[PDB]
């Protein structure tokens, strides 16, 4: 009963007959002769529910499963040809139906499919033209979270399987494997479906990209060209973001956490120097995973960004040399800061501002710090110390720039600060320099700050971290069901405390004291009050801070690779404390070795410590209770022998992560002295 295209009813004709003749080979003949043909499939239907019913009926028979598999293996390689050489989709926009039909098969993630069928199908799918991908992604964004999870898992298992099954090395790169690259491009397709399927707030949260004006030389060249007003061009934008019209930064809440898209096995194998090269220089035969940033973990991303920073620092060094050769002028290749311990903030401001005004490109040189009166080579330890001092001084309540919350242990901008916009610019620049120099800072900002840095205004929902006493109160106000005007007697006027403790009345709306808050306007009031606290009360200071930060990061791939939650990790470091990795990378000095009894007892003790004792131990040994990007294993801790057994406590040099440990006579004594040191420091 041969037929050129297939439907649910046509299938039922055979379900009954095959059961009645106790056979399956005719239905197998049919399904093979159907699903091996792209045209038959494209013509067969969009009828999602019918497809779902059909699969739910057919996949109940093992013999038929092998036929689906065997048909798919035949189908995909031909579809790749259609898309690559015949542009079939441009002739028939229904061609996409084929992929929709296949993807509703629930068994694609069983190993039988992973070895051959799914890879081939990925090769075909990953060639779809952008407009088609956009059509497909928009459909997927309507699916249930578990279904996104299934699709994500379907490709995740494949990427995992191929990474585990193949031997990758510095001569056989993951970038050269069509199967993993194709799978990643598919997974990217799912990723954007997850983005678009989440909650997206685009109309009330955009802030202008403020760019620092370049040096006079580049300005003159821009003036010699027709570009006097075209200073704003944006970073490298992803084609899919253009086709969909929604950025990764626009989604407030996805269906599945972005972290689940990270493929750890892949990250363990990927060589970032080469990937960054392929990201910068397009080669027809090689792919770059940086074009698929959702799949990389923060360590891998940071290593890419570090290659960018270092390649730029090196470019600026070349420019310095070229200027010296052609014009004789001698410029410093480093961002050499010289400051006095009694005037760190002032010296740093004047110097960084003179540098920013004379040459805004200098801020992109490698940082090098010198304390006036002290002598040493800045191998990072002097810089780290400089950052500690600056951060401590800037957050001192006596400077009035920031308010500290005892509950969350987070800092927030003081609306009442009379201090000049200079200091705010300085702290902004410092944060930039810290990322640029891969140094963790003990700064404690709520998530809103990193969102505002990325160009998104803080929304009501961001108060959940910065002002819990406020967020809760506003949430209560929204949840109340009585007459807000009679029951709460609040107006569009609010009270703020001045440095001198005086309550300053601020009108959210003109003559706000005469305007009552009603149930119809309360959501607007909350939006305005949130906008006041998160924006319009600090906007004077915050705008300066943000400017300072962009002066260092304006050309960085930062806006493309990272998200607010990942910026925090770059600046402050991670909260996950793997002491096994720390043991594996710890170095020994003064005659200790990894095989020393005292050292083995030390690791037994430290592994037996509580997480709080562990945080204290890190704070004591390193100056921060957080682990760098990549965990404690990246922290080159040095355990150096500080003489024989004594009653003294151990001591530390936080600028170089050195622990000065006496050679105690017993495990109990070591434990008691170490606990006492880390508790009483």
């Amino acid at each position: 009963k041969d037929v050129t295209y297939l439907t649910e009813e046509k299938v039922y004709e055979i379900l009954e007959l095959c059961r009645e003749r106790e056979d399956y080979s005719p239905l197998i003949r049919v399904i093979g002769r159907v699903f091996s043909s792209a045209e038959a499939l494209v013509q067969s239907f969009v009828d999602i529910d019918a497809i779902r019913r059909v699969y739910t009926r057919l996949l109940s028979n093992e013999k038929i499963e092998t036929a689906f598999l065997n048909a798919l293996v035949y189908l995909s390689p031909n579809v790749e040809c259609d898309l690559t050489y015949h542009n079939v989709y441009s002739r028939d926009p229904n061609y996409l139906n084929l992929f929709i039909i296949v993807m509703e098969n629930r068994n694609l993630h069983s190993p039988e499919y992973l070895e051959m069928a799914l890879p081939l199908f990925c090769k075909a799918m990953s060639k779809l033209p952008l407009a088609a991908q956009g059509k497909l992604i928009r459909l997927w964004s309507k699916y249930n979270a578990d279904q996104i999870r299934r699709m994500m898992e379907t490709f995740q298992q494949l990427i995992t399987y191929k990474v585990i099954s193949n031997e990758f090395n510095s001569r056989n790169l993951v970038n050269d494997d069509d199967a993993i690259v194709a799978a990643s491009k598919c997974l990217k397709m799912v990723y954007y479906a997850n983005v678009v399927g989440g909650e997206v707030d685009t109309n009330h949260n955009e802030e202008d990209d403020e760019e620092p004006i370049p040096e006079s030389s580049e300005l003159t060249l821009q003036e010699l060209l027709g570009e006097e007003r075209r200073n704003k061009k944006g970073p490298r934008v992803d084609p899919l973001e253009t086709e969909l019209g929604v950025k990764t930064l626009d989604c407030r809440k996805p269906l599945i956490p972005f972290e689940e898209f990270i493929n750890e096995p892949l990250n363990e194998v990927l060589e970032m120097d080469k990937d960054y090269t392929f990201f910068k220089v397009e080669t027809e035969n090689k792919f770059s995973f940086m074009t698929c940033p959702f799949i990389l973990n923060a360590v891998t991303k940071n290593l890419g960004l570090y290659y960018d920073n270092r390649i730029r620092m090196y470019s600026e060094r070349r420019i310095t040399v070229l200027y010296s050769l052609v014009q004789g002028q001698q410029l410093n290749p480093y961002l050499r800061l010289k400051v006095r311990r009694d005037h760190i903030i002032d010296d740093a401001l004047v110097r960084l501002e003179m540098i920013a005004m004379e040459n805004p490109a200098d801020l992109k040189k490698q940082l090098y710090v010198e304390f006036e009166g002290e002598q040493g080579v800045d191998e990072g330890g002097v810089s780290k110390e400089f950052f500690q001092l600056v951060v401590e001084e800037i957050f001192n309540p006596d400077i009035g720039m920031f308010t500290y919350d005892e509950s969350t242990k987070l800092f927030w901008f003081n609306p009442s600060s009379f201090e000049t916009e200079g200091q705010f610019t300085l702290i902004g620049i410092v944060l930039g320099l810290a990322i640029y120099n891969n140094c963790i800072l003990d700064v404690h900002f709520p998530m809103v700050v990193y969102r505002k840095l990325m160009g998104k205004k803080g929304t009501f929902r961001d108060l959940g971290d910065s002002h819990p006493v406020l967020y809760q109160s506003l949430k209560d106000l929204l949840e109340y069901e009585g007459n807000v005007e009679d029951d709460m007697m609040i107006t569009f006027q609010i009270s703020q405390t001045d440095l001198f403790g005086n309550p300053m009345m601020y009108d959210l709306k003109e003559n706000g004291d005469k305007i009552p808050i009603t149930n119809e306007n309360r959501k607007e009031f909350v939006n305005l009050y949130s906008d006041y606290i998160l924006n319009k009360s600090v906007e004077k200071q915050f705008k300066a801070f943000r400017r300072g930060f962009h002066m260092v990061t304006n050309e960085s791939p930062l806006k493309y690779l990272f998200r607010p939650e990942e910026i925090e990790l770059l600046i402050c470091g991670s909260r996950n404390l793997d002491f096994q990795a720390l043991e594996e990378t710890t170095e020994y000095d003064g005659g200790y070795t990894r095989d020393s009894v005292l050292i083995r007892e030390f690791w037994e003790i430290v592994h037996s410590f509580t997480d709080e004792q562990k945080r204290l131990f890190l704070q004591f040994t390193t100056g921060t209770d957080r682990a760098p990007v990549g965990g404690l294993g990246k922290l080159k801790m040095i355990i150096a022998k500080n003489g024989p057994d004594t009653e003294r406590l151990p001591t530390s040099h936080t600028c170089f992560n050195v622990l000065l440990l006496p050679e105690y006579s017993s495990k109990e004594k070591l434990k008691e002295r170490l606990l006492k040191a880390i508790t009483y420091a």
């Binding site: 580049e218 003159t220 060249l221 060209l225 397009e282 027809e284 420019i319």
Partner: protein, 142 residues
């Protein structure tokens, strides 16, 4: 005088007629060194489709040495990424023939013949500060 910021001629031919003079008659200073251009350089400035820069109503051009120097510096400073012409056409949804590309070494706009050469020799186009550049025949041969 050209002391009106908005209403002074931009391209050398226009400045010739505005000063009732010809390209064969006019003498101009280079905006960096304020040295006088050789007539050969003046012609090339007209051929390179560059803009007159004005300071206090005075016109300035750019000589060959300065232009090459500052362009090379700008390459070293604002290089972004390099694409194949084919890929570039897809990113901008236009054929390379129509897209504005200048010489990275000497700013001269690239002819469709030179653009084709880039495609023929599988050579990439470089994005600098957000504008696209390639290498003209007189700079790929040197």
């Amino acid at each position: 005088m050209f002391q009106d910021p908005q209403e002074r001629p931009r391209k050398l031919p226009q400045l010739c007629t505005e000063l009732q003079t010809t390209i064969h008659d006019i003498i101009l200073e280079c905006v960096y060194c304020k040295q006088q251009l050789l007539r050969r350089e003046v012609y090339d400035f007209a051929f390179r489709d560059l803009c007159i820069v004005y300071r206090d109503g005075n016109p300035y051009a750019v000589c060959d040495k300065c232009l090459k120097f500052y362009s090379k510096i700008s390459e070293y400073r604002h290089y972004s990424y390099s694409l194949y012409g084919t890929t570039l056409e897809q990113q901008y949804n236009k054929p390379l023939s129509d897209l504005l590309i200048r010489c990275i070494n000497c700013q001269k706009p690239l002819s469709p013949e030179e653009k084709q050469r880039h495609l023929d020799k599988k050579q990439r186009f470089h994005n600098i500060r957000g504008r696209w550049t390639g290498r003209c025949m007189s700079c790929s041969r040197s």
